[PDB]
């Protein structure tokens, strides 16, 4: 897939999922791979452990793009506050759930347009429990995103034919990230433990990127 001008550029199509819960270890690994990766996904395990100030630290130290994987899933008024606080902290983008419906997603889009940031709609998840409710809703949530002007999506890499279906719904231009055949549909992949648990994170990141070639 070629880059679309109107959506974000992720260096080497590789997003680091930084789910270490200790500030020292998180900063060490991220600094090590900065020459390979410019986009870092940070979630609640790190921010609840170390504080939201860690976002600004990642930005001041590494100048990386930060996606807050907060899976926002509240009522509209609350979603607005969560997004505002998160963007105020310096996040470039936030991941939101679609299951709570269109108004809850729109609340996030509103704050993001006010503040000049981005919203990623999470369409589907990879874990077994996702079969119970999320799987059956995934296509409709994706279509809802399209009808909300959403331009950034998250989908699972485990079942590639699901990404093909997703890509059919969202169209060829929207930005899609996913936690080889994956990159025929997604614009970037998300990798955590294979990098941040390796003895040489920079080598792990380099190896993955060589495969992408």
Ligand X SMILES: O=c1cc(O)ccn1[C@@H]1O[C@H](COP(=O)(O)O)[C@@H](O)[C@H]1O
Catalytic residue ranges: 71
Q: Which two tokens stand for residue 42?
A: 């940070």
Least Å distance, CB 10 to Ca ion, is: 9
Cα-Cα-Cα-Cα torsion 58, 150, 85, 179, nearest 10 degrees, comes to -40
Least Å distance, CB 177 to Ca ion, is: 13
Closest residue by Cα to residue 78 from 106, 101, 104, 100: 104
| CA dist., res. 98 & res. 76, Å (int) | 12
Contact between 83 and 72 (Cβ < 8 Å): yes
The residue within the footprint of a second copy, chosen from 30, 86, 174, 182 (CB under 8 A), is 86
Which residues ranging from 97 to 116 are in contact with Ca ion (CB under 5 A)? none
| CA dist., res. 79 & res. 101, Å (int) | 12
101: left (phi over 0), alpha (psi -120 to 50) or beta: left
**By CB under 8 A, which span of 57-65, 100-108, 166-174, 197-205 interacts with a second copy?**
100-108
**By CB under 5 A, which span of 1-9, 10-18, 30-38, 47-55 interacts with Ca ion?**
1-9
Q: What are phi and psi of 106, to 5 degrees?
A: -60, -35
Per CB under 8 A, 78 contacts a second copy: yes
The residue within the footprint of ligand X, chosen from 8, 10, 16, 17 (CB under 6 A), is 17
**By CB under 5 A, which span of 4-12, 42-50, 129-137, 163-171 interacts with Ca ion?**
4-12
Give which of a second copy, Ca ion, ligand X, none residue 47 binds (C-beta under 5 to 8 Å, depending on kind): a second copy
Give which of ligand X, Ca ion, a second copy, none residue 190 binds (C-beta under 5 to 8 Å, depending on kind): ligand X
């Amino acid at each position: 897939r070629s880059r679309r001008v109107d959506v974000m550029d992720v260096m080497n199509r590789l997003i680091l999922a930084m789910d270490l819960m200790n500030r020292d270890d998180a900063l060490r690994v991220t600094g090590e791979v900065r020459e390979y990766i410019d986009t870092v996904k940070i979630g609640y395990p790190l921010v609840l452990s170390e504080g939201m100030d860690i976002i600004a630290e990642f930005r001041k130290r590494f100048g990386c793009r930060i996606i807050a994987d907060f899976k926002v899933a509240d009522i509209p008024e609350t979603n607005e506050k969560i997004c505002r606080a998160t963007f105020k902290a310096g996040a470039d983008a936030i991941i939101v759930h679609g299951f709570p419906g269109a108004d809850s997603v729109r609340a996030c889009l509103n704050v993001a347009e006010e503040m000049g940031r981005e919203v990623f709609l999470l369409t589907e998840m990879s874990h077994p429990g996702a079969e119970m409710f999320i799987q059956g809703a995934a296509d409709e949530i994706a279509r809802m995103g399209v009808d909300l002007g959403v331009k950034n999506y998250v989908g699972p890499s485990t079942r590639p034919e699901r990404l093909s279906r997703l890509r059919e719904i969202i169209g060829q231009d929207s930005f899609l990230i996913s936690p080889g055949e994956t990159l025929r549909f997604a614009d970037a992949i998300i990798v955590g433990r294979s990098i941040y648990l390796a003895d040489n994170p920079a080598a792990a990141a380099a190896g993955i990127i060589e495969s992408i070639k």
